Amino acid sequence: GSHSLKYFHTSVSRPGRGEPRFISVGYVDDTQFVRFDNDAASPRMVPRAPWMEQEGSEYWDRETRSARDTAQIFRVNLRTLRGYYNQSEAGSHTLQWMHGCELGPDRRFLRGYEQFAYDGKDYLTLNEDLRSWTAVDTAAQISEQKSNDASEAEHQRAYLEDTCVEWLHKYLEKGKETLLHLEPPKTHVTHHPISDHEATLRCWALGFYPAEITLTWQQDGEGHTQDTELVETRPAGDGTFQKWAAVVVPSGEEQRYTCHVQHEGLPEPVTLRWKP
Amino acid sequence: VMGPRTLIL
Amino acid sequence: MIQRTPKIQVYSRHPAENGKSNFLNCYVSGFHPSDIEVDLLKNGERIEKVEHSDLSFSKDWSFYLLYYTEFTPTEKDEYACRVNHVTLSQPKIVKWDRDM
Structure with a gap:
């Protein structure tokens, strides 16, 4: 390119x-x-x-x-x-x-x-x-x-x-x-309870180059940019980059949400759910 | 490489 | 004088594992002027010998530096980043959370 x-x-x-x-x-x-x-x-x-x-x-x-x-x-x-x-x-x-x-x-x-x-x-x-x-x-x-x-x-x-x-x-x-x-991102979702009824779903993208990337959460399959805490793309310090996206979710409804990752080193876009 | 001459302001 | 406030992020090179050697990072960006002070703290104490990247900037003139050192995460040991800029009324400290 x-x-x-x-x-x-x-x-x-x-x-x-x-x-x-x-x-x-x-x-x-x-x-x-x-x-x-x-x-x-x-x-x-x-x-x-x-x-x-x-x-x-x-x-x-x-x-x-x-x-x-x-x-x-x-x-x-x-x-x-x-x-x-x-x-x-x-x-x-x-x-x-x-x-x-x-x-x-x-x-x-x-x-x-x-x-x-x-x-x-x-x-x-x-x-x-x-x-x-x-x-x-x-x-x-x-x-x-x-x-x-x-x-x-x-x-x-x-x-x-x-x-x-x-x-x-x-x-x-x-x-x-x-x-x-084209070094593709290594993705995964983490789970972090906030209370008995809320929890943070955080989608990671690690060790990727170049720096251009897109992390999105989708609720049920719809747009959902509100609620999504997005951090700036950060250098890992070894030549690659990091970035994560987090959304707050009711305990028990994790599967409703999906993380979508777009990178140049990815043949097709990628989707992640949190696996209990 | 970088440029041989810059600007005198 | 356009003076802007530093945006800070503390994190590890790789996903933290207790006992596994790693790198701790403090990415300071979006600030101006370039004069900035950055410390890496272990249990409140400043870590000796911390390397930082070369001073560069973005399309909007904001500067960005990366400070880093090689550490080994433990359950007990606490790590943090201490930053001081002219736009800060006092040193801003943000702790390292292996979850972010």
């Missing part, structure tokens, strides 16, 4: 305790594979996926250079941003930057995106055709004119449409075993 190569950049100033902390992470789909943290002495881009542990010095030299360069620009942008607002030199401020490229299920290039955020709010944004920027925050108009006068979008369109895509393909090859493996 569709695949993507996304990066997430974050720089946070600490006015009192020195230079801004910069962190960078790379993702193929729901898998992180690289990261750069400038919070150490002699910082480098390091692998965070096993299928990356055998790359050449040449690779990490270049990624370390790019990350380093970005960290310095973000550090100075922060100071610049401080003036765009009448902000004091005492507060810590946050600059974020995410960019990625997506392949269609047909495996070709489909789309690209790029965005900046200041203190958690849409700041500057690259247009869909990737040929110019837009001030989303009214206070970003200067950053906008400077970016469009210097054709910064052109360097980004180049990266997103060509460079980024090529490496996404390489990454999918190097990591095929896990990246292209």
Whole structure:
């Protein structure tokens, strides 16, 4: 199906305790594979996926250079941003930057995106055709004119449409075993009495990848989204994901309810009842 | 890989 | 400043079995700014050597981290997660229930 190569950049100033902390992470789909943290002495881009542990010095030299360069620009942008607002030199401020490229299920290039955020709010944004920027925050108009006068979008369109895509393909090859493996969820229902007359039916979905999933309870066979406590999809920490759904039920009527699971690694949807 | 140059704001 | 409150979840890597080695997790998400403090508590005491994932964020700019350590669930021993954010008037503690 569709695949993507996304990066997430974050720089946070600490006015009192020195230079801004910069962190960078790379993702193929729901898998992180690289990261750069400038919070150490002699910082480098390091692998965070096993299928990356055998790359050449040449690779990490270049990624370390790019990350380093970005960290310095973000550090100075922060100071610049401080003036765009009448902000004091005492507060810590946050600059974020995410960019990625997506392949269609047909495996070709489909789309690209790029965005900046200041203190958690849409700041500057690259247009869909990737040929110019837009001030989303009214206070970003200067950053906008400077970016469009210097054709910064052109360097980004180049990266997103060509460079980024090529490496996404390489990454999918190097990591095929896990990246292209549809790991299906392991499901089951648990029972938890609340009183003599009520009980919680909790449907689990464990150890599945990718992260997209759907858990629904059906009363008798009808919709029943009210009553269903749904937790956010959570990382198991070994590369897979978890998620559960719970519904409150009268003691003795468990069989009326059924759990429905939809995943990409499941040939057909799955149904669970609680088995006494 | 990530981009060679980012934006000067 | 957009300041958002952390959403917390404490849970194990695998379904808990007394005596069986496992991993305890504290997934903190949907928060902002990124400055956050997370402890893993055993019987009220902070567990030494706890690894966390790399700082990332979602389409809406919210940050998410995973804190984790390898433990062995016992019937008696109690585990919990202690979080502190600027948006919290005091450390929020949520206990680990192997049922959730």
